[PDB]
Amino acid sequence: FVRAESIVAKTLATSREKERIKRVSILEDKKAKNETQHIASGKDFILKDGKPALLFIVRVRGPLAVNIPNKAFKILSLLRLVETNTGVFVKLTKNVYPLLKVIAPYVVIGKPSLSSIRSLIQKRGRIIYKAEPHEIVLNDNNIVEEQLGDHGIICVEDIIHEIATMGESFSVCNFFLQPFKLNREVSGFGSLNRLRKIKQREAESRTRQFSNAATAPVIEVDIDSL
Amino acid sequence: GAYKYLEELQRKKQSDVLRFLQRVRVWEYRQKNVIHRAARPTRPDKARRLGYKAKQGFVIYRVRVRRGRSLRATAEERVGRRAANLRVLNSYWVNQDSTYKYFEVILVDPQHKAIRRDARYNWICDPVHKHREARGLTATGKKSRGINKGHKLSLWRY
Amino acid sequence: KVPPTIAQFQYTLDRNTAAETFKLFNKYRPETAAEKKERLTKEAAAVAEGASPKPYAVKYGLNHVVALIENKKAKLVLIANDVDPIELVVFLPALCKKMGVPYAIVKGKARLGTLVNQKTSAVAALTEVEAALAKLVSTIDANFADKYDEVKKHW
Amino acid sequence: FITRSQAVRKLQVSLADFRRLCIFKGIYPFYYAKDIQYLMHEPVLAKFREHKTFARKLTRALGRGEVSSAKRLEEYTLDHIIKERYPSFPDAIRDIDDALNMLFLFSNLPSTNQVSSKIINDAQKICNQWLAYVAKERLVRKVFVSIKGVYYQANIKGEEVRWLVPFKFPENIVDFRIMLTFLEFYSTLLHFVLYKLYTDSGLIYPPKLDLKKDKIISGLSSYIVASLFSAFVFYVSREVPIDILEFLILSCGGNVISEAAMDSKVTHQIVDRPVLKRTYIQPQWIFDCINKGELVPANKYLPGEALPPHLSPW
RNA sequence: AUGGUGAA
RNA sequence: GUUCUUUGUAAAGUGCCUUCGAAGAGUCGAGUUGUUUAUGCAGCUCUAAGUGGGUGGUUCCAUCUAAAGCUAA
RNA sequence: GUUUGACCUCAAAUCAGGUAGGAGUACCCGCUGAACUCAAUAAGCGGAGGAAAAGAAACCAACCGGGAUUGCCUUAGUAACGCGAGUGAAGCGGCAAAAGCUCAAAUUUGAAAUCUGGUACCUCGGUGCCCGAGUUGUAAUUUGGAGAGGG
């Protein structure tokens, strides 16, 4: 059994999310056609363009328990970021640019750093393959030398360079990396964890805010937070 | 204030509500020891009009006395005997039974610094008031002594 | 057997309406000692170096709550069921009904006091509020004051 | 002598806190009464009781509500224990040889529910100071490249600490609670040890540090045998860890340029690939030279040649 | 009579 | 006497205009049973009023506000 | 969400801060109380101080009003009783001394403004901080002589 309030809240949130998605898609369709005559804006900007740029994305929980919507759910499935606290590197492009707005409410994006990328790669990594359910970590470069390296990506440093330098094998390595499941912030409950979570939740509102405007600038935050 | 209504409610003791309350509380009182501490007064209006206050240092006791000397004075003396370091300022009725009578007694601690530090009650800390109930100087004691108002050998040098 | 005047409690507000009432009361929690002290210190510092709208808070003290009652200043009255001296609250529902003021009963005096800082509050009331108060009053009426208007019966 | 349960009951402290107290002090056989009596007089018991009271009051506030009270409620180091277990600084340096292995292992562990991110950050930062200090006094004397890791041996005033550097590969994850207490104690010791070492080195402490360089490599290249590789500059290929090679060269007094810096006196280039296009040398040459000060020419470590038998230098 | 003393 | 402080839209009194405006319950009382120097107290059933009540003597009048408490001489 | 904390109650401490026993007992305050109406005497019991107790009228008064309590003279060996043995006062009058008063009682609600304990300073205490008591009522404002709000 479930109380009435939950269903009504879920319906209200789903309606708003669907309306925002429809408006954004309709505006982007006209923007792509280049008519730009009776729309709010035609240009794009970021405040704190569609030029190439490697960015890190983290799947955040919330908003309220909205039923999986087709557009955003499919977009996340393309990046396989369904699980919370999961992140993956994607090559920014003009075609991929509207995807940010499409899945802006569910994810946070920003510009990573070479040190951060190196630390993340050398500290976490998955290779889900040979029954092949094993989640073997990047223990040794032998797997990288065998399965990978056809394009010259023989060691983990090569993967780091490809990810940071957007090499040809960026697509191959990124799929092979089985993007990492980052640990949640509080990761606890009980006497101290409740207060710590409550204190941390306040920063979420001031950091993870959605203006819902069709021409809202791309939301960007430094990846140095984690 | 609630006391204005509480006094009137307590006036009609024969009323159904108070009759039920007394018979409910009699068993609980009986299950308790002969003398036991009371966290709060069951008749706050009576205690407050008797000069009792909820501030620190005030203690409410209850004691059971056989029916059939004045019962109030005997109860005060009995509570004072066990409560040697406390002073029995006053006592009042709360419940009666066929075989026993229950009287609530309010105690004031003279050693507590809170009682000594206020001018409204520091007088009780004087040694003259020690064992006030023993000498029958309380309200019940004075009434028993017959201190009412009205009709109710020597040889000089020359 | 309990007399008809007693047992009016124990039969209390429903779960959902009680939760809504608690949530509404939490919106007007009185300033605590620490918050009041820090606000006063800040005001003193501002004045010492280099005029506000009237505040609002829930009413809880029995004496002043009853003082507001009878004067018709109490928009809503919330009463605890587990109060040890029953006589303190036996007459309160009757007074509220006579004065024509909405009233409700809850289970747990400590839960009543948790929303007003104090350990226990016995009863609580509100003087001013934004607009959900009318809806809550109507719900409380239709769920307790009119549905259980036969409290004078039974034993 | 009294039983462990009897001692716990006498101290009326849960076994979880008794473990921390014993680790800080050290008690073992069944147990001598005198040790328990001495422990009971420690001030740490009062702090533990205060922490328990704080936790229970916080739980009370959270259950009652008014989160402001819980936030306002938020308002120690085992310095005394350090003196007891380490009567003198040389004793602390002696105990370092086995104590700091836990800290160095924790420096590369991943964040999880069992270990807060703050602990890992502190462990990593402690390495940034340890390596920085070791690269100024040039006390490195051994560089055994073991399977467990590069077995460093810094001659810290003649005690030859046997600290081991774990590999940079992901250390996939035992009761970490005891490990957490050991890490906390070792970090408390490290604070004072690093303070003393920096004061002895003559550098103002804490000195300035560079964060832009940290964002590039994040390691020893920040925060500002010895005769080997004087003024030498080596280029590191994409198949070697800069964190290890750069530290040794800097201690020797040379310089290192990272290939991934954008991800002259270039006497040598460290390369391991079978295909190459500077004096190309395998990484084994640097380790062999440092282990004994041979300063052997590059002819004995050309890339692609058979590796020599590297006997353990102990 | 009051209050104590002791004994087969 | 001598002094360092005197303070903050702080406190009190008095006459004028105006509006408001409480009182100690198993208690007084009553009947009985024991005590008392025909007062009072005690055990007990009953136990109430607030232009109300307690004490008195002349056709119903005079005074006071009890059932809480402190206080040198 | 079968986990939890509150509130209420019941226990424990070689825990911290506190107090009663006993003695003296002429005087004082209550209980009990014997015999040659004797006598509310003696003994016994419990409790205190330098005095104790009482003390500011639900008093006496029938006046042209007095006006906290207690002692002396007088009232008076009178009223009254047992008219019989014996008991036996009180108002008024004069003398020595005089003092007032505090809570329940009506909203501090535009701010529990109150206070105990622990800690750091200068110490028959004061300041900051922390906890606890407190709303089932802690401060000022009102105790019938009335009293409160305002101009």
CB C52 within 8 A of CB C39: no
Across the interface, whether the CB atoms of D68 and C35 are under 8 A apart is answered: yes
Q: Domain range for residue B153? A: 1-158
* Cα A226 to Cα A59: distance, rounded to the nearest angstrom: 13
Would you say how long chain B is, in residues?
158
Contacts of D59 in chain A (CB under 8 A): 191
Identify the sign of the CA torsion D279, D284, D287, D293.
negative
Q: Please identify residues in chain B, positions 97-156, with a C-beta within 7 angstroms of any atom of strand G.
A: 111-114, 117-118, 120, 127-131, 134-137, 142, 144-147, 149-152, 154, 156
- CA dihedral (D134, D139, D145, D149) positive or negative: negative
- 3 state DSSP class of C80: strand
Pick out the nucleotide with least CA–C1' distance to C83: G136
When computed from its CA atoms, the radius of gyration of chain A, rounded to whole angstroms, is 20
Q: Provide Rg for chain B, Cα atoms.
A: 18
Which residues have a C–N gap over 2.5 Å right after them in chain D? 29, 75, 173, 224, 263, 277
C-alpha B15/C-alpha B9 separation (Å) is 9
For strand G, which nucleotides have at least one atom less than 7 Å from a protein CB?
4-10, 17-21, 29-32, 40, 46-49, 51-55, 57-60, 69, 72-73, 90, 102-117, 129-139
* Alpha-carbon radius of gyration of chain D: 24
Cα separation, A182 vs A191, in Å, equals 24
8 Å CB contact between C75 and C67: no
Task: Spell out where chain B is interrupted, by the residue before each break (C to N > 2.5 A).
Answer: 68, 152
Q: To 10 degrees, what angle do helices A114-123 and A156-165 make?
A: 140
Contact at 8 Å (CB) between B87 and B59? Answer: no
Number of H helices and E strands in chain D, helices first, is 11, 7
DSSP letters spanning D241-264: -HHHHHHHHHHHT-EEEEGGGG--
- The Cα–Cα gap between A138 and A125 comes to 6
Q: Return the structure tokens found at B32.
A: 């308790």
For residue A135, report the phi and psi dihedrals to the nearest 5 degrees: -100, 55
Fold of the domain spanning C1-155: 60s Ribosomal Protein L30; Chain: A; (3.30.1330)
**Phi and psi angles of residue C103, each rounded to the nearest 5 degrees, phi first:** -145, 155
| CB neighbourhood size of D302 (10 A) | 13
Looking at residue D234, the DSSP 8-state letter turns out to be E
Per-residue flag: B34 CB under 7 A of strand G: no
Chain B environment of C3 (Cβ under 8 Å): 16-17, 19-20
Q: Which of D59, D60, D62, D66 to mutate to test the interface with C (most CBs of C within 10 A)?
A: D66
**Separation of alpha carbons D101 and D107, rounded Å:** 10
Distance in Å from F31's C1' to B88's CA comes to 34
**DSSP-derived secondary structure for chain A:** ---HHHHHHHHHHHHHHHHHHHHHHHHHHHHHHT--SSSS-S---B----S--EEEEEE---SS-PPPPHHHHHHHHHHT--STTBEEEEE--TTTHHHHHHTGGGEEEE---HHHHHHHHHH---EE------EE-S--SHHHHHTS-TTS--SHHHHHHHHHHT-TTHHHHHHHH---BPPPSS---SHHHHHHHHHHHHHHHHHS-----TTPPBP---GGG-
For residue D286, how many C-alpha atoms fall within 13 Å in the half-sphere facing its CB? Answer: 33
Sort out which chain C residues have CB atoms less than 8 A from B6's CB and list them.
87-88
Question: What resolution does the deposited structure have, in angstroms?
Answer: 3.9
* Residue with the two structure tokens 């070492």: D197
Listed residue (D99, D96, D109) closest to D174, CA to CA:
D109
Give the count of domains, chain B.
1
User: What is the C-alpha separation between A61 and A6, in angstroms, rounded?
Assistant: 17
Determine, for residues B2 and C6 on separate chains, whether the beta-carbon distance falls below 8 Å.
Answer: no
Whether residue C31 lies within 8 A of chain D, CB to CB, comes out as no
Give the β-pairing of C103-106 and B58-66: unpaired
Query: Any long-range contacts for C129-136 (C-beta under 8 Å, 24+ apart)?
Result: C129/C24, C129/C28, C129/C56, C129/C75, C132/C20, C132/C24, C133/C24, C133/C75, C133/C76, C136/C17, C136/C20, C136/C21, C136/C24, C136/C76
Q: Which two tokens stand for residue D81?
A: 């224990």
Look at residues A225, A194, A123, A179 and name the one whose alpha carbon lies nearest to residue D123.
A123
Give the DSSP H/E element, type plus range, for residue D280. Answer: strand D279-281
Experimental method, per PDB record? cryo-EM
Q: What six digits make up the tokens of B98? A: 């066929």
Residue with tokens 């040649």: D305
> Which runs of E-coded beta strand occur in D61-174?
140-146, 149-154, 164-165
- Position D313, amino acid: P
Q: Which residues of chain C neighbour B9 with C-beta distances below 8 Å?
A: 87, 90-91
B5–C67 CB contact, under 8 Å = no
- With an 8 Å Cβ cutoff, is C129 touching chain B? no
Considering all nucleic acid strands, name the nucleotide whose C1' atom is nearest to the C-alpha of residue B18. Answer: F26
